[PDB]
User: What shape does this take?
Amino acid sequence: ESMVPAPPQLAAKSYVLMDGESGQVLVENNGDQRLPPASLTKLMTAYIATKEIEAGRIGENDLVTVSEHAWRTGGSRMFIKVGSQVSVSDLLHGIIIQSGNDASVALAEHIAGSEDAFADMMNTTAQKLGLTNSHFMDATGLPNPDHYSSARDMAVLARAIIYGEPSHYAIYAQKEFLWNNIKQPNRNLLLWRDKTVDGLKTGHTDEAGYCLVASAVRDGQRMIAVVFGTNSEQARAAETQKLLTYGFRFFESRNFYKKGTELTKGLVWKGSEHEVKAGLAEDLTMTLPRGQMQKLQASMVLEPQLMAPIQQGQVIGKVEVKLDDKVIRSADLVALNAVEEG
Assistant: This one.
């Protein structure tokens, strides 16, 4: 019919284009292959930190003592002095802007005691995000057989980061950071090249090639592009722009339901109330090739024998959207109001 053009074929080992609002993968090539992430690892390190801050388990002004192990790192670094005290906020800028290996290690040890226990939190967090092909051996991305991620996993991680605290995500777009008499630019060159790009991270080794997790916003849409293994910085940027354009030019986004509002009722066994109001945890939005919105229909099926007690946000049923009798985007219906067991 009026099927949009095929996606560009990029010179790169893997890539994924993901819409921001909907979180749907729009294009995917070799998306689940386990590849070395190099500095892309730092997206996981920083994210954990931001989640610990949100949970109030660490504070932005808390002073972190720099161990010998953190100071012994190599590669890109913030140049924190061994034995000095540095705040969580400053280290986080060092990780995010400068991809500082020292800062990564110091903040990991501050959070979990040691880098090995932090890697555990990285894997637990991977699971919690639903990463399918990611595993972490340290907080920096040192080359290791068991240290890997994929283009799709990185888009999932990036989306979780993008939609966190705005003051935290804004760090990704900061152009430079000064520490200990050394001022260094944000390593993400696209920042200077394209004003609609606001993140996130580059990675590179001889083994992994030139990698990038980028996100841009144009005309009310957010695209997330992940590319692994390009041939050079120039190709990395060029191939990412092609991927981005393809998403912006050929896909449209429509908001269907906002989180909360009731969609339907449900039978509860043993509860003081006879039924609960089901809804969605957060906005449900679809992003699809032009002219496809029109072909969508939604099924909201609850659980037959759901029995109390029922907690607010508890997994009850699942809403499913069919594209011509073909199920695609499936969200999670949850009980809004809690229910007793009188």
Notes: The two ends are 57 Å apart (CA to CA). The first helix runs from residue 41 to 54.
